[PDB]
Write a protein that binds this ligand. Structure first.
Ligand SMILES: COC(=O)[C@H](Cc1cccc(C(=N)N)c1)NC(=O)CNS(=O)(=O)c1ccc(C)cc1
Ligand SMILES: [Ca+2]
Length: 223
């Protein structure tokens, strides 16, 4: 997260860290045994870390649970990142409490102008690299598709939405991938891609979760 602020320990209870010997992507807990992340974060040997704040220090509220199954969206395209979404089932159910909780799925799609919360342990610099050990937060609005296209020259699909600031300075970044974009207390997006980080006229692009609710529910029900 570039240009954000320190969230505060466990204030984003649904945030998860995907670990394969080190943190490599974020994710969101949607129920006691399932996590949603980005398809481009797919990898074998994933351990899900819940209740985290400082990812390099055991602070007392963590829950480390190995993944038993990963399901990448059937239509994921790694070239365009269309359908950049993946489901991860935990080997055992997490113990839900005030520091470890699930985030609800949306019943409707959020409109442009809506303010959302983006969080992650990703790079905090637009130029160079600096990775924080504690969770960072960013308040960002959903941009209209028309304004995003005209300013960035990105090619986005109906399964994506831009969020952030065209003026640059604030944005998600490397390492925040797979993380949550929460608006009105519901999971509306997943950190997917962007050109660099916090660059002018190059906002972040997010997976539009509201288009996948049916797939998510059906998959969880039979797996
Ligand atoms: C990969 O390194 C980076 O610093 C960022 C990461 C990132 C990830 C998710 C969201 C954001 C964001 N801005 N909100 C940033 N992405 C890039 O800089 C990628 N742009 S790119 O034009 O460098 C590019 C595009 C395609 C390939 C195969 C490789 C590189
Ligand atoms: Ca920790």
């Amino acid at each position: 997260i570039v240009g954000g602020y320190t969230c505060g320990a466990n204030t984003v209870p649904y945030q998860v860290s995907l670990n394969s010997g080190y943190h490599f992507c974020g994710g969101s807990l949607i129920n006691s045994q399932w996590v949603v992340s980005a398809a481009h974060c797919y990898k074998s040997g994933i351990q899900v870390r819940l209740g985290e704040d400082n990812i390099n220090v055991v602070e007392g509220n963590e829950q480390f649970i190995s993944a038993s199954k990963s399901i990448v969206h059937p239509s994921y395209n790694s070239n365009t990142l269309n359908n950049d979404i993946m489901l991860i089932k935990l080997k055992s159910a997490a113990s839900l409490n005030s520091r470890v909780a699930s985030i609800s799925l949306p019943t409707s799609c959020a409109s442009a102008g809506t303010q959302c919360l983006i969080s992650g342990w990703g790079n905090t610099k637009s130029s160079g690299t600096s990775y924080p050990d504690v969770l960072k937060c960013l308040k960002a609005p959903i941009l209209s598709d028309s304004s995003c296209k005209s300013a960035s020259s990105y090619i986005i699909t109906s399964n994506m939405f831009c969020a952030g600031y065209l003026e640059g300075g604030k944005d998600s970044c490397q390492g925040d991938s797979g993380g949550p974009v929460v608006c009105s207390g519901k999971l509306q997006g997943i950190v997917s891609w962007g050109s660099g980080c916090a660059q002018k006229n190059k906002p972040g692009v997010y997976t539009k979760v509201c288009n996948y609710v049916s797939w998510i529910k059906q998959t969880i029900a039979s797996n």
